[PDB]
Nucleic acid binder design. Structure first.
Lengths: 198, 198
DNA sequence: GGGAATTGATTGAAATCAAGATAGG
DNA sequence: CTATCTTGATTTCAATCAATTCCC
């Protein structure tokens, strides 16, 4: 129905893993990471949510990943129960909720293949192409997250990510204007470094 | 509504990647693997579907993973269009379909953490515990798949999986009655070798 | 009998350990 | 100024390469 606005500071938790899934959120400005942790501190980031993306939608009762703002972020949010009510009233709403979860599933399925099977360079080339599609403006990606967040998204250390980016820069495949301002100079070459579907 | 029966031989493809998602399936007997391939032959298994499990449900128009019988398998299946009609007629059907996809998402989220962050031994212990919960009979797991399928589910080589299983055996954690007949002797010790949540 | 599994030897890609260089605040 | 990022040195865990052995 009606959304309400809210903002979170860089690094503020928006919800925790296993916390009640009481609201559903949409990024207006900024960026959010969703992740799971192990007890010794190892962290897998499952997804980055960028402006316009919806997150926190759960069919069940609890958030299965924690979510934190990467940088100061403004979101819109709606009560989960308000969505459940609308879905009951309107077959089209119910179908759109399922579609949202299905798109999350498709992203996770592709991401399992990356984490289980791709080389470090393939993973970084995949990542740069995904970000270019999602956030490039007039050819340039202003990436909101650190090298440690990129590594924890890709199942790699930040040093390996840095090394792959350095190599791509030396080869003329990308340009830098500072470490997180990246301009892809040849998407085709970079596409050739990811792994290809059978 | 009305399900029909069908069977597939060991290694027969049930549907391909990117193929039209025309039917939804439930294992009655046997076992199925869902996977994605890369062009050089590398393979990530996203899930094993065991008796009673439903698979091949897509919100979108096509299968995002291929599916193959691991051993001779009997399934029940229904037309996807038949499900879409029931879901339009009944709010609880629509809701169950969303819940199915959401359970697949929860599995894939956990599995990303495993593929991105768990050591080889943690992955194998996770796998044995998952299979014990889903398929043990009076304490013993008759695993339907090869070591190569296990490694492709866990982002490991079959040799690494063999070594971890050998080690668990030598430590008294599991028993063998042949390679794929496994009896967990101490689930607590094995749970301690998986990695724990924060 | 023969694909599957175990086991051993070795390599290798990414992690870890360790300085510096960079550049946002 | 101080995190973040890059780069280098070295280690390590799992992969790869290579025979046997065990069972279906």
């Amino acid at each position: 129905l009606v959304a309400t606005e809210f903002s979170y500071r860089k690094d503020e938790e928006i919800y925790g893993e296993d916390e009640p899934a009481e609201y559903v959120y949409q990024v207006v400005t900024g960026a959010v990471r969703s992740y799971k942790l192990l007890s010794d501190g190892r962290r897998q980031i499952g997804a980055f949510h960028l402006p316009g993306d919806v997150f926190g939608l759960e069919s069940g009762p609890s958030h299965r990943l924690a979510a934190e703002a990467i940088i100061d972020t403004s979101v819109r949010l709606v009560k989960r129960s308000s969505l459940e009510k609308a879905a009951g009233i309107d077959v089209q709403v119910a179908r759109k909720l399922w579609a949202m979860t299905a798109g999350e599933l498709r992203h996770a399925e592709d991401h399992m293949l990356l984490l289980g099977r791709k080389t470090a360079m393939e993973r970084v080339a995949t990542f740069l192409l995904e970000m270019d599609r999602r956030l490039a403006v007039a050819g340039m990606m202003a990436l909101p997250m650190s090298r440690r967040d990129i590594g924890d998204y890709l199942g790699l250390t930040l040093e390996t990510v840095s090394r792959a980016l350095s190599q791509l820069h030396t080869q003329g495949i990308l340009g830098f204007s500072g470490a997180r301002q990246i301009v892809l100079r040849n998407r085709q070459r970079l596409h050739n470094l990811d792994a290809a579907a059978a």
